[PDB]
From a paper:
The BAF155/SMARCC1 subunit is a component of all complexes identified to date, incorporated either as a homodimer or as a heterodimer with its paralog BAF170/SMARCC2. Here we show that the N-terminus of the BAF155/SMARCC1 subunit contains a putative DNA-binding MarR-like domain, a chromodomain and a BRCT domain that are interconnected to each other to form a distinct module. In this structure the chromodomain makes interdomain interactions and has lost its canonical function to bind to methylated lysines.
Residues 27–383 of BAF155 were expressed and purified, and their structure determined using X-ray crystallography. We therefore set out to determine the structure of the N-terminus of BAF155 using X-ray crystallography. Residues 4–160 form a four-helix-bundle that resembles the MarR-like helix-turn-helix domain10 based on structure homology analysis using VAST:11 43 aligned residues, RMSD for CA atoms of 1.9, score 5.1, P-value = 0.0005 for the highest scoring protein. Residues 169–287 consist of a BRCT domain with a chromodomain (residues 219–246) inserted between the second and third strands of the canonical fold. The individual domains are linked via a network of hydrogen bonds to form a single structural unit in which a highly conserved stretch of amino acids in the α3-α4 loop and α4 of the BRCT domain plays a central role. The N-terminal residues interact with a region of the chromodomain that in others forms an aromatic cage that binds to methylated lysines. Computational analysis using PeptiMap18 predicts that the pockets within this cleft could bind to peptides, suggesting that this region mediates protein–protein interactions (PPIs). Six missense mutations of BAF155 identified in patient samples that map to the module are predicted to destabilise its structure as judged by Missense3D19.
Author numbering: 27 to 210, 217 to 302
The structure:
Amino acid sequence: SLAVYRRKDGGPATKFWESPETVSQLDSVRVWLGKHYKKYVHADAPTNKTLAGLVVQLLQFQEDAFGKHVTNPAFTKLPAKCFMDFKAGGALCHILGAAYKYKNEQGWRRFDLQNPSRMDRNVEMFMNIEKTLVQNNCLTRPNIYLIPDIDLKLANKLKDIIKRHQGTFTDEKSKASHHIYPYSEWLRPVMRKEKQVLVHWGFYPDSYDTWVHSNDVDAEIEDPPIPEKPWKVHVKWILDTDIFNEWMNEEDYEVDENRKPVSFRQRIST
């Protein structure tokens, strides 16, 4: 099986982040930060690789603090896709800008994401990071509509999961991000660099996406579906989110308007 090399944790792929292309991609992030979060980054004058290392520290912190192994975490992991958005006004810029703004506000001499004494203030930073992403339209937490056919006892359990993971639920399908239907081993390649291919493991969150050698994955990378409000997924999308403390990839759980599972892209067996 290829699941041999599946990540056992949602920690950062440090080699991807230290790679020269990624360091190069952060250049526009550094420049954008210098213009719009200037009073918070001017002192530290972060280089491209310093930003890259900060991303590793940030990703490692939320996996250590809010990971699958943590019973009742104080917070839910930020989506891994947020850290993959290197565009000028994108999510990664607001992530780093919020981190530097928060550090300036607390008067910290430096980031210390390994200090157990600073756990609660580091959690506080991530809350400020999530708010910055949401209020700048880079992140939208699920606003969930439960199909009325779901058993009331299950629906109430799903409602508690949704609230414990920064989500809300609504009674008007008009404004729901997701519609949840009753529900009655593979991977998918998502990115290719060098001889490395990033693969997504079915029923695992995006932080568990693993860089593997392209010769072990002959499958073609297909185009991700374009988002049309709302996602139609079944209840295991919410149930699995509670397991990993990280909102699952909707593609793995999608159903059509008759509750039958569908997969826009191909599923490659492990």
